[PDB]
Amino acid sequence: NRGRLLCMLALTFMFMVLEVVVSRVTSSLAMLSDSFHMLSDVLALVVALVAERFARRTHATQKNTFGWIRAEVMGALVNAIFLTGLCFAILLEAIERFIEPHEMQQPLVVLGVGVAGLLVNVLGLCLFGQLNMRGVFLHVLGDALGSVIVVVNALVFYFSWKGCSEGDFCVNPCFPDPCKAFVEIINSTHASVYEAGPCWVLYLDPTLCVVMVCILLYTTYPLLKESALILLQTVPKQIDIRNLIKELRNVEGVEEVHELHVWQLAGSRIIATAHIKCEDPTSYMEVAKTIKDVFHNHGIHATTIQPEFASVGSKSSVVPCELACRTQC
Amino acid sequence: NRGRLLCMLALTFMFMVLEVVVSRVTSSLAMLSDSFHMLSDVLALVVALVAERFARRTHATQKNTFGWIRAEVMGALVNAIFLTGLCFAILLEAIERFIEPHEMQQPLVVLGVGVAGLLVNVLGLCLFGQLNMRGVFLHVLGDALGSVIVVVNALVFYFSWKGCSEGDFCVNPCFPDPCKAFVEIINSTHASVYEAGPCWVLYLDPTLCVVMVCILLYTTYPLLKESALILLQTVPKQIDIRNLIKELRNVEGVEEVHELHVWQLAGSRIIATAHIKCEDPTSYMEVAKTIKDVFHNHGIHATTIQPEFASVGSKSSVVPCELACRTQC
Ligand SMILES: [Zn+2]
Ligand SMILES: [Zn+2]
Ligand SMILES: [Zn+2]
Ligand SMILES: [Zn+2]
């Protein structure tokens, strides 16, 4: 449905506006750098929306004689790439939180907007073309787990951390404090009291991002396998070629079955070609009806069985099919 | 060739090792954060390498009755998505250099490694399956233009900027200096001399990244159009369906031409189906030879022309094709 992706696109725009509003109210330019990062969650909805007005034009057009009945199972692919590509990004970025750990300065406000985002994505998840559903549901599960990360982080971050207490002049041993250490080592004045807070919670986030990454990259892969397999002309999973060939040769009136191509258009519109070699060119229609039946019994319905009638003395050359070109094909 | 992508993969690993070596020698943990960003240039070579040992298995296997002759024109797609996706990343990140501009502390060393990277990518470009070539050449042109950015930046950055001079205690008006302003406003001591350098060169980089992004996103798109078009079963650009149908109906012996599917397997292996409606079921082979000729004259060589022989009184129903199923197909 277009209604669902439309509603969810509207919701994410709402939340980005709320985020810019908080980032400007609090006057914290370090938080306005997520209202530009949700433009990566609006893209996976715009794409699966564009591929909704294209799986309905299922009519033979001079520019595609099957129609765009496939632009569904391509949309999913693009999504399941973007996400996975994007997913590695998180992983890469998680490494930076092990080398130069930053500090979540204002934890009440981050808990606030994180719980708002977690609720809007719980709705975007409870809201949910059979592979666009999957290619977008995974993409909202991603940011939902990201929001659970943000809450469980900024939850035990006001509960535990201590940070610099006496104004702006204290020693932060847990990481290479840029101004505190600079001014404190360039001026030795025996200043006021200090403190030191736990560090077992300074790296309680990148571990959560690594877990979210290993969750998405396993929930996504089977979707990506199925999409690329459909798009590589591969026999579906439910049709065994050797059985089709044994059954075509069992039929009366035929003796050989040349090029036998089977594939999958989209969903369950499976096609099938075959040359064939009848013997008597007058009882052909009964043979073709029988062959269409032995295709219909195997979930394969749109066929094309060209019969190659044998001439005089030419039953010694398969490559010509009795009907061929010259060399290339 | 596998040799070219192998050589280039070896070169990029060499350069990443050189980058970690400099980042550890100089003791500048702000530069080790590019030896993790070149793991995004090794991916587009690993993919177009995996799709090299898969466009050579062009043999009918029970798991694909065309073979993987298409896994070339899919590889390109994945590349031309990754890059474009990745390209938006740059653009997004360029915006951060307009809001909170950072400082290239050590410009001689950055010029050094930037010129080394620019030379290794000039080689990776001069080094260069007809769409993998394009899907990887664009991907090296990307980082080559990135390197030109790094050189022209860190070139007129030692030539112009001034920065803080008298030890570690000066005023930096051009941007919200974190330690200088903090310690200078928390302690009013009438300290030593200061200075102020130009700001027309502090934002001489993100403009270069925006130009590199608008260069890649126009050099990539036509590749992505062609790849997705091949993968959506679309008639090629060189075969006009109306002409094929007019020419099949002009041929003797036939009167109607049912489902006429034409598409593109990969490169130039174009297939074509067609039912057809002959009249006299004894002169069929001549008609089929003529039809194969009027397909061969149009760059379309792998055909399948099923003839539907008319029964008694049934020349009033196209939907049955004289040969059909029941309702669904
Ligand atoms: Zn999102
Ligand atoms: Zn993170
Ligand atoms: Zn690169
Ligand atoms: Zn940049």
Q: Are residues A137 and A243 in the same domain?
A: no
Whether B170 is in a domain gets the answer: no
- Interchain pair B296, A325: CB under 8 A: yes
Whether A6 is in a domain gets the answer: yes
Sign of the dihedral defined by the CA atoms of residues A143, A130, A55, B264, in that order: positive
| Of residues B78, B182, B329, nearest to A168 (C-beta) | B182
Whether B256 is in a domain gets the answer: yes
Distance CA A141, CA A149 (A): 12
If we measure between CA atoms, which residue out of A173, A243, A160 comes closest to residue A235? A243
Whether A113 is in a domain gets the answer: yes
If we measure between CA atoms, which residue out of A46, A34, A40, A36 comes closest to residue A9? A46
Distance CA A40, CA A83 (A): 9
Distance CA B41, CA B13 (A): 10
B41 marked ligand binding residue: yes
| Residue found under tokens 């990201």 | A146
Token readout for B280 is 């006299």
Q: Are residues A18 and A129 in the same domain?
A: yes
| Of residues A81, A260, A284, nearest to B309 (C-beta) | A284
Q: Are residues B240 and B226 in the same domain?
A: no
What residues have CB less than 8 Å from B103, skipping those under 6 apart? B163, B202
Domain boundary among the residues A231, A256, A289 is at: A231
Q: Distance from first CA to last CA of chain A, Å, rounded?
A: 43
Whether B307 is in a domain gets the answer: yes
What residues have CB less than 8 Å from A8, skipping those under 6 apart? A45, A124, A127, A136, A140
- Interchain pair A65, B241: CB under 8 A: yes
Long-range contacts of A54-60 (CB under 8 A, 24+ apart): A55/A129, A55/A266
Q: Are residues B211 and B265 in the same domain?
A: no
CATH number, domain with residue A114: 1.20.1510.10
Q: Are residues B73 and B221 in the same domain?
A: yes
User: What protein residues have CB closer than 5 angstroms to ion ligand 1?
Assistant: A 41, 143
* Interval between CA A110 and ligand 2 midpoint (Å): 13
Q: Which residues of B touch A92 (CB under 8 A)?
A: 36-37, 39-40
Q: Are residues B267 and B294 in the same domain?
A: yes
Resolution in Å equals 3.7
Q: Which domain holds residue B16?
A: 2-161+198-231
Residues in chain B: 329
A41 marked ligand binding residue: yes
Q: Which residues of A touch B76 (CB under 8 A)?
A: none
| Residue found under tokens 């250490």 | A181
SS3 (DSSP) at A282? coil
Whether B266 is in a domain gets the answer: yes
Helix axes B107-126, B132-155, angle to 10 degrees: 160
Distance CA B176, CA B183 (A): 13
What residues have CB less than 8 Å from A275, skipping those under 6 apart? A257, A258, A259, A305, A306, A307, A308, A321, A323, B304
Domain boundary among the residues A187, A215, A231 is at: A231
Distance CA A237, CA B295 (A): 33
Sheet holding A270-276, edge to edge: A262-264, A270-276, A302-307
- Interchain pair A284, B281: CB under 8 A: yes
- Interchain pair B178, A179: CB under 8 A: yes
User: Quick count: other Cβ atoms within 10 Å of Cβ A113?
Assistant: 21
Domain boundary among the residues B180, B210, B231 is at: B231
Rama region for A267: left / alpha / beta (φ>0; ψ in -120 to 50; rest): left
Question: How far from chain centre, in Å, is Cα A304?
Answer: 35
Rama region for A327: left / alpha / beta (φ>0; ψ in -120 to 50; rest): alpha
Residue A41 C-beta-side C-alpha neighbours within 13 Å: 27
Whether A189 is in a domain gets the answer: no
Whether B18 is in a domain gets the answer: yes
- Which residue stretches of B26-170 are H helix? 43-50, 71-99, 107-126, 132-155
Long-range contacts of A249-257 (CB under 8 A, 24+ apart): A251/A287, A251/A290, A251/A291, A251/A294, A252/A287, A252/A290, A253/A278, A253/A279, A253/A280, A253/A283, A253/A286, A253/A287, A253/A290, A254/A278, A254/A279, A254/A287, A254/A291, A255/A279, A256/A318
Rg (CA), chain B: 31
Contact A143, A42 (CB under 8 A): no
B265 sits in which H/E element: none
Residue A119 vs residues A25, A151, A225: alpha-carbon distances, Å: 22, 11, 31
* Interval between CA B48 and ligand 3 midpoint (Å): 14
CATH number, domain with residue A270: 3.30.70.1350
Q: Are residues A224 and A80 in the same domain?
A: yes
Distance CA B143, CA B221 (A): 17
Method: cryo-EM
A139 marked ligand binding residue: yes
B139 marked ligand binding residue: yes
Distance CA A226, CA A62 (A): 29
- Residue A304 forms beta bridges with which residues? A273
Contact B157, B49 (CB under 8 A): no
Distance CA A30, CA B162 (A): 26
Q: Are residues B127 and B271 in the same domain?
A: no
Token readout for A108 is 């009440």
Nearest-5° angle of CA B152, CA B157, CA B161? Answer: 155
Q: Are residues B220 and B243 in the same domain?
A: no
* Interval between CA A90 and ligand 2 midpoint (Å): 7
Contact A156, A204 (CB under 8 A): yes
Residue B232 vs residues B114, B244, B260, B300: alpha-carbon distances, Å: 41, 21, 16, 18
Q: Are residues A279 and A148 in the same domain?
A: no
Q: Which residues of B touch A311 (CB under 8 A)?
A: 285
* Interval between CA B39 and ligand 1 midpoint (Å): 24
Dihedral of the alpha carbons of B16, B22, B27, B33, in degrees to the nearest 10: -30
Distance CA B141, CA B145 (A): 6
Rama region for A269: left / alpha / beta (φ>0; ψ in -120 to 50; rest): beta
Q: Are residues A72 and A14 in the same domain?
A: yes
Q: Distance from first CA to last CA of chain B, Å, rounded?
A: 43
| Of residues A242, A273, A323, nearest to B62 (C-beta) | A242
The β-bridge relationship of strands A262-264 and A270-276 is antiparallel
* Interval between CA B214 and ligand 4 midpoint (Å): 14
For residue B183, the chain A residue with the least C-alpha distance is A183
Please state the domain count of chain B.
Answer: 2
